[PDB]
Ligand binder design. Sequence first.
Ligand SMILES: O=C(O)[C@H]1C[C@@H]2ON=C(c3ccc(Cl)cc3)[C@@H]2C1
Length: 133
Amino acid sequence: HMCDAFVGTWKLVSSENFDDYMKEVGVGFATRKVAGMAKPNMIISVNGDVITIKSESTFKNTEISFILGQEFDEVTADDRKVKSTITLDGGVLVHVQKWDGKSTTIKRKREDDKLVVECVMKGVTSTRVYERA
Ligand SMILES: O=C(O)[C@H]1C[C@@H]2ON=C(c3ccc(Cl)cc3)[C@@H]2C1
């Protein structure tokens, strides 16, 4: 019953500062423009110890499956090849991505009926709010 309140199908309803987050990460112009238009659905499921997070949009479809605390390799929507580790910290899914000596952290939390996603790279934060689909 690990992660029960995250499981389901979620739709993006608002984004703030995502262009600047993508800039900070190193995403190029054309990818930022197309990625920034997307209104993904995020589909979270759990089977035993394995959590799966899918993101589907007109821009890209991504899927990760993982065990908490156990590093895995991820190809991000912008084609970075990163090493990822996801843990639960006080009810928040904390996702760290490492690549080329760089690091970004993505937090996912349940707040009221929303799933709030906070993406941080150095001093730049973006907040993306999802609602149940
Ligand atoms: O809303 C979300 O799912 C957040 C968390 C995800 O993890 N990485 C994202 C990302 C990075 C670069 C690009 Cl170009 C697009 C998307 C997603 C944005």
